[PDB]
Amino acid sequence: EELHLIPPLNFSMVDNGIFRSGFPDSANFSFLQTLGLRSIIYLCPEPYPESNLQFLKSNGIRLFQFGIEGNKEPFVNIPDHKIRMALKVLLDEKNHPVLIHCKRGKHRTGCLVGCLRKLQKWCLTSIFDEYQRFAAAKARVSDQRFMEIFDVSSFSHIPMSFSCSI
């Protein structure tokens, strides 16, 4: 086959040991195996399909599910607590390498990554630009507003010695 690896929908590296994507399917499993994942942070409330559960079991991957309802704008309401819990998992380097995913890798995943960038002291315009690159024509002002007002205070003490940015 030679060119045989298929990263999942909207796949990207976020930082050392942190990846983002939409929902993996079996065509993506050989690529995800190469990343030596310890963790998935899964941001949809739907049960993980059997195919994906077998992949986690076979590969020794822990599933962290913080289900955020997949509403359309303007009827979206990202719960602060779920993002807060997900950031706590993301900030524990023992969980790396970790893949964050939702359905499309644009909205729920975009919000969690944007809140991480706020902890990494990125200016809002740089955070929004990265969010928009993935969300493309489906960029939601509400997701960027969520990142704008998300309170980082509780996380200030946590060292991020894992990051490429020190």
Author numbering: 49 to 214
Sentences copied from the publication:
Although the WPD loop is missing its canonical tripeptide motif, this structural element contributes to catalysis by assisting PP-InsP delivery into the catalytic pocket, for a choreographed exchange with phosphate reaction product. Additionally, we conclude that the hydrolyzed phosphate remains trapped as an enzyme-product complex, until it can be released in a prisoner exchange with another PP-InsP molecule; the latter process is assisted by the WPD loop.
The oxygen atom that is positioned at the apex of the phosphate ion’s tetrahedral geometry points away from α4. This oxygen makes a hydrogen bond with the unprotonated Nδ1 of His155 (we will return to this point below). The side chains of Arg156 and Cys150/Ser150 also make polar contacts with Pi(A).
